[PDB]
């Protein structure tokens, strides 16, 4: 799916039987995601980006549906104010930054 | 220029006769950039993302060359550990997130 709209390319993601807006974060290397409803079987970690380091849960193997398209990947669940989709997911949906 | 390489789409940008690695961050809305020497003419501000809020300088009208291509835009110079290229710049180089 092409997504330009000279604005934030957000995609309705479907993780842990849930749906939220995801900020296509081609900048991040993984798909972070504000706290949500995910089952255990994950690993505790912390990302360090702009402002400070937040705590998230590396959920490897999460069927996140972006753009009505199935896409499993590592979703980090933490206190992030946005559902970040990094390369870990831009590689499953085949996202490409052509400019 | 198409950039997938299932990894971080970094691009050597040339801002104010300067050059650094820019993490193509379609997630951000503007082009943040670790502290550096910009062409003056800017305003003090602070972005609030992952971890906390960092302080940057909205440098509006900065000739940032991405992919050997000239591209003026708003480069926020602050204590960011990376040169983020948000939509503000993904709209000048005509970037498109297709997956
Ligand atoms: O912290 C941000 N991370 C941090 C981050 C770390 C780890 C992951 C998962 O691996 C994802 C995101 C990225 C930028 C960055 C990456 C690495 C080092 C330094 C910076 C991201 O790529 C960017 O999209 C937004 C995400 C965001 C945006 C809004 C609200 C919450 C989170 N930010 C913050 C940001 C804020 C404003 C601008 C300018 O508009 C740019 C970035």
């Amino acid at each position: 799916p092409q997504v330009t709209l000279w604005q934030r390319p957000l995609v309705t993601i479907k993780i842990g039987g849930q749906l939220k807006e995801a900020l296509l974060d081609t900048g991040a290397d993984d798909t972070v995601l504000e706290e949500m409803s995910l089952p255990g079987r994950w690993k505790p970690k912390m990302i360090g980006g702009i402002g400070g380091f937040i705590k998230v849960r590396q959920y490897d193997q999460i069927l996140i549906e972006i753009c009505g398209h199935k896409a499993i990947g590592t979703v980090l669940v933490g206190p992030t104010p946005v559902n970040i989709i990094g390369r870990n997911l831009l590689t499953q949906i085949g996202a490409t930054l052509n400019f």
Side-chain angles (χ1 to χ4, degrees), chain A residues 6-52:
Chain A
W6 275 46
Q7 270 212 54
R8 312 177 226 156
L10 260 122
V11 320
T12 318
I13 72 126
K14 208 175 212 203
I15 280 160
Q18 294 226 339
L19 276 173
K20 302 193 218 218
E21 314 142 308
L23 170 72
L24 264 179
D25 201 26
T26 316
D29 299 31
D30 240 316
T31 300
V32 117
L33 250 101
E34 71 174 282
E35 230 201 299
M36 72 121 64
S37 193
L38 227 48
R41 240 243 217 119
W42 47 275
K43 253 165 194 177
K45 71 124 73 179
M46 260 174 98
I47 56 154
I50 307 185

Side-chain angles (χ1 to χ4, degrees), chain A residues 24-88:
Chain A
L24 264 179
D25 201 26
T26 316
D29 299 31
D30 240 316
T31 300
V32 117
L33 250 101
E34 71 174 282
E35 230 201 299
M36 72 121 64
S37 193
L38 227 48
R41 240 243 217 119
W42 47 275
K43 253 165 194 177
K45 71 124 73 179
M46 260 174 98
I47 56 154
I50 307 185
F53 304 65
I54 61 153
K55 282 152 165 197
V56 297
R57 322 209 152 80
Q58 193 173 228
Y59 267 112
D60 289 281
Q61 319 235 297
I62 295 280
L63 185 274
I64 176 189
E65 200 191 60
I66 283 118
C67 250
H69 288 304
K70 241 122 127 150
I72 278 266
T74 318
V75 209
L76 307 96
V77 191
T80 179
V82 149
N83 287 310
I84 315 283
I85 279 41
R87 299 310 316 261
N88 73 304

